[PDB]
Structures are given as structure tokens and as C-alpha cells.
Design a protein around this ligand. Structure first.
Ligand code: PLR
Length: 457
């Protein structure tokens, strides 16, 4: 409005240009959905700075005489968080609007609305409610289990189809329940759910003694996502809650449609996803989503005290920068890289007298056999994982046979294989969101060089 110096025509075009940024911000505040095209950084930072001004710690004429005033010692800390200091929620409700932080409260509502829009876009079009929690997937599963205790005070067991992952297994024990490990059935090369053993354990222990059935979608090959439809029917019949571990299944349309079809024909009370694995942000946050708004609110109000806004801000920045088209592009390129990674493993397996485990139901992880490797006591399988780690290859885990691990008092036989005696040792490789073609070409090149070193030795 300073037309005293600059000509009025040029100030009018600049002030009218600001209306274009306010148009994008208004559309987000009204519809609460992910924009199709990503915002420019100029629009995003203008939006973030305007939100932070609404927080009482950033008021020009504010005075504080309490114990939690959002004071910041280091200017580096304040700037790297865009001056969002008060966090999210209140002492009694993590979903409540914080009176001292209107901008942080609005940031939390918009983030959960953007996340809900992505969950529908990813495949679960029928999701009712969700919320971001600044805890990992393991601790977020624990929060679901802690909520179910007060609704099922006579239950002490959690029925859990086996998956060799320490975080989700410890969630059941951290919540104070006893996991009932259901071994998997070897159908071809795939380890799938044993529906007969699951329903048998329900009748042996009694439905009232079961806290919930804890299934899992995204997992390492040769394990595949659980039969969520049949497990949801069992949960609906015996009136047992169903909690789905969907750690990195948002990036997979097959995983999300499983959760959708399971809630369509049966019962799914909540499914939990990781922020870092599905949205390419730092580790630390998760999403608790469900189809019963009454129950999702119960989980949210079960959280004691305020919580960090840092994961919510990272997801807000990322989704607004990518847009719904930007996220869709990454979902399409992940399917392309999955086919490319599969074909490169097939070609490399033939040259070394190996094969690719046929796991068509796992759309993220692959497994190449390592049968023609260890000379019983040559330690070649263990050496391969160390040589790959030496040549700066991460994410390719090696699963040997006969491994035994004790996790929180429970001893697993055949650890990392999801079963007691898998036929052979294998090598894992996955196509996750954001993987470039250079990752596969460097992986194949360095894996080939590592295999030559063992064959030559
Ligand atoms: C990511 C992961 C988890 C939990 O990871 P956190 O360390 O809690 O963030 C649980 N189950 C599976 C299959 C996972 O991949």
C-alpha cells in the first residue's frame, strides 16, 4: 500500500500477485485437501510465517508468567522450527485446540486433513478419521493396545501372525500383553497367514481373553501381507478388535486395497502407518487411522499431555510441496522401479546359479536365493552382508538359516525368515518410494562384485 514511492500501477500488480498466494492458502483452509500441484516455496513459507504469528509466544506485546511460555534460548532452534514452539494439543487432549497456540492448533488440523486426503488417494477411500502422532509405528501400536485395555479389561493375549521385526513385536509387550505367535504356512515360496491356527487359538483361549488380532501388511519377502479379509471376518464374528500394522503400506495400492476390502467385509478397528517410510521425512512420527471416528478419538484422547509438532510440520511442508500429483508420481515410479529391480535380480541370479523367490503377493520387497553360497562353515552368507555394507549398500539385508534371536524373553527360531525352517537363505531387496534407477544399477553392480569375491575365495 506504499504507493508514495513506487508507481501505483506497479504496486497494484504486486498486491494483486499476493492475492494469488492467498487464493492457494484460502483453498487449503476451506477444503482441507492436498493441492493437485505443489506450492512454490514462496507460498509455503508465507503460509508458515503467517501461522506462526498466530501463536501467543510470537505476539509482539505478550508477557509470560507461567512455566510453559514457549520461550526459546537458541535462535537457531527457533528458526529451524519456523517459530512453532508450543507443540500440539493440550494437557488433557492431544487433539484439542491449544488456546495459547492458535497457529500450531491450525497446523495440526490441516496436517491431519492432508494426511486423510492422502490415505484416500492411496487406496483406502473409506477411511473415516486419522491423526498424526509424534511417535514411531511401534510406539503408536502400543497406544492402540493401551486404549483397548480399558474397553476389554478381561483380555491378556494378542494374537499375532509372525513377522520378524523387533519394533512391532515389542509393542505388544510394552503395552503389557502376552503375544500369541501364530506361525505362517509355506505356500510355494510365500509365507502366508494360517487362518486355521488363528481361529483355533481364539477358541482355545476364549474370545474375551483376546485383546485383539494384530495383523501386518507391509513386510519383507518371502512373507506377504496377511489375509486381512479372512482375518476381519473372524474378528467380526467373535467380536474381537483388529489392529493392522501398515508400517509402509501407504505407498502400495495392493496393501491399501486390502485394508479397504477388509473393512468392507469385516472388522478393522485401526491401522497404523509410518511417516518416514511413506512420506520421505525424518523418522519419529506415525499415523493412526480407522473407520470408527468414536474409537479413533478414544486413541487420541488416550495420549497424555502435549506432543511435538515437528513430524506434523515435516509432513505439512512435504505434502504442500509435492501436491497430490507429486505424490502420485512417486507412487507410479515405485511400481516402475519394482519391475526394473525384479528384472535385474533375475538376470543376476542366472549368472550365479541362483533364482528369484516367486512372491507375487509382496509388492514392495524381493528375495533372491543364496543356496549356492556358504560352504557349510565358510561364513559366506554373513560375509556377503558385511561386504555390501562396506561398499555403501544399505537396505539389502541377508537372512541366513538357523538364526536364533531372543527378543524380550521370547526366542525366535529362524529369525529374520518369519518361520522356523525356511528352505534356503536369501537376500532381500525392496523398491520403496523415492528410489531412483541409479540405486538399482549401483546395487546390481556392487552385488555382482561381492558375489565374485566369494566365488573366487
Ligand atoms: C517400520 C517397521 C515397524 C516400526 O518401525 P519403528 O522403528 O517403530 O519406527 C514395524 N513393523 C514393520 C514391518 C516395519 O517395517
Amino acid at each position: 500500500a506504499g504507493e508514495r514511492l513506487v508507481s501505483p500501477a506497479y504496486v497494484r500488480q504486486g498486491c494483486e500477485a499476493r492475492r494469488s498466494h492467498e487464493h492457494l492458502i484460502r483453498l487449503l483452509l476451506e477444503k482441507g485437501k492436498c493441492p493437485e500441484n505443489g506450492w512454490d516455496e514462496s507460498t509455503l513459507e508465507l503460509f508458515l510465517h503467517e501461522l506462526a504469528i498466530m501463536d501467543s509466544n510470537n505476539f509482539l506485546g505478550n508477557c509470560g508468567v507461567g512455566e510453559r511460555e514457549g520461550r526459546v534460548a537458541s535462535a537457531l532452534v527457533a528458526r529451524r522450527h519456523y517459530r512453532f514452539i508450543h507443540g500440539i494439543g493440550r494437557s488433557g487432549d492431544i487433539s484439542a485446540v491449544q488456546p495459547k497456540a492458535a497457529g500450531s492448533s491450525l497446523l495440526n488440523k490441516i496436517t491431519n486433513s492432508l494426511v486423510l486426503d492422502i490415505i484416500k488417494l492411496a487406496g483406502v477411500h473409506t477411511v473415516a478419521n486419522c491423526f498424526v502422532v509424534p511417535m514411531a509405528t511401534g510406539m503408536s501400536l502400543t497406544l492402540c493396545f493401551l486404549t483397548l485395555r480399558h474397553k476389554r479389561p478381561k483380555a491378556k493375549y494378542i494374537i499375532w501372525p509372525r513377522i520378524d521385526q523387533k519394533s512391532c513385536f515389542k509393542s505388544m509387550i510394552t503395552a503389557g500383553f502376552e503375544p500369541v505367535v501364530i506361525e505362517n504356512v509355506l505356500e510355494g515360496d510365500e509365507l502366508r497367514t494360517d487362518l486355521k491356527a488363528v481361529e483355533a487359538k481364539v477358541q482355545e483361549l476364549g474370545p474375551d481373553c483376546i485383546l485383539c488380532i494384530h495383523s501386518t501388511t507391509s513386510c519383507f519377502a518371502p512373507r506377504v501381507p496377511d489375509r486381512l479379509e479372512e482375518l476381519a471376518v473372524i474378528c467380526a464374528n467373535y467380536d474381537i478388535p483388529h489392529i493392522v500394522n501398515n508400517a509402509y503400506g501407504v505407498q502400495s495400492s495392493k496393501c491399501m486395497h486390502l485394508i479397504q476390502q477388509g473393512a468392507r467385509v469385516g472388522r478393522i478397528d485401526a491401522f497404523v502407518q509410518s511417516l518416514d517410510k511413506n512420506f520421505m521425512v525424518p523418522v519419529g512420527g506415525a499415523i493412526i487411522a480407522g473407520f470408527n471416528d468414536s474409537f479413533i478419538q478414544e486413541i487420541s484422547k488416550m495420549y497424555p499431555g502435549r506432543a511435538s509438532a515437528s513430524p506434523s510440520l515435516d509432513v505439512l511442508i512435504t505434502l504442500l510441496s509435492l501436491g497430490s500429483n507429486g505424490y502420485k508420481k512417486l507412487l507410479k515410479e515405485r511400481k516402475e522401479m519394482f519391475s526394473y529391480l525384479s528384472n535385474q535380480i533375475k538376470k543376476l541370479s542366472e549368472a550365479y546359479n541362483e533364482r528369484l523367490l516367486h512372491t507375487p503377493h509382496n509388492p514392495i520387497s524381493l528375495a533372491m536365493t543364496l543356496k549356492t553360497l556358504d560352504e557349510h562353515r565358510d561364513k559366506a552368507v554373513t560375509q556377503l552382508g558385511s561386504m555390501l555394507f562396506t561398499r555403501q549398500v544399505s537396505g539389502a539385508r541377508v537372512v541366513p538359516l538357523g538364526s536364533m534371536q531372543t527378543v524380550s524373553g521370547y526366542t525366535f527360531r529362524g529369525f529374520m525368515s518369519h518361520t522356523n525352517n525356511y528352505p534356503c537363505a536369501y537376500l532381500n531387496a525392496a523398491s520403496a518410494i523415492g528410489m531412483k534407477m541409479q540405486d538399482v544399477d549401483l546395487f546390481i553392480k556392487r552385488l555382482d562384485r561381492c558375489l565374485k569375491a566369494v566365488r573366487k575365495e
